[model samples]
Target: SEESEKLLKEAKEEVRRLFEEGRPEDAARVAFEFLQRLLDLGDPDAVKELLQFLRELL
Candidate 1:
């Protein structure tokens, strides 16, 4: 729970940081790092990841 909470904080900053960058390269990097992991496997763990991050997105 603690580790996951940390990721949420990181994701929050990452969201704001990305908002500033607004470039596909960094976007692609983030996508590959996060989205690709989710797509690569059948695990629902990454689903939570996306959901949490998206929630922090706002």
Candidate 2:
């Protein structure tokens, strides 16, 4: 739980940074890294939630 929480925190930070950048290339890179970390942790539910939120943003 602690590790997953850390991952979520990092993901949130990266997404916030990505939004600040407002560049597709940078956003894609950060988003790919974030997704990779989530999948590496084997947490599909979190990834799905993130994806749903991303879809809403679009």
Candidate 3:
């Protein structure tokens, strides 16, 4: 859906902005929120890989 893609895009921008502001935790939160949305309507395999990528970051 275009709406979901838009939301994810906004969230990703916010994550980068938060990190630039030295708020890694907030960035993570925003990222997770976006990921949760993907889980709700995206491919499970892709979402799982995304989760792993996030874990690697942690």
**Best model per TM-score:** 2
Can you write out model 1's per-residue Cα lDDT over 3-56, one digit (the tens) per residue? 545554564466557756786467446644655445455545655776666555
Candidate 1, residue 44: lDDT = 55
Off by over 4 Å in 3: 43-58
Each candidate: what lDDT? Answer: 0.57, 0.71, 0.68
The predicted structure with the larger lDDT, 1 or 2, is 2
Largest lDDT belongs to which candidate?
2
Model 3 residue 47 lDDT score:
55
- Cα-based TM-score, every candidate: 0.44, 0.69, 0.65
Model 2 misplaced stretches (Cα beyond 4 Å): none
User: How far out, in Å, is residue 9 in model 3?
Assistant: 1.1
**How much does candidate 3 score in TM-score?**
0.65
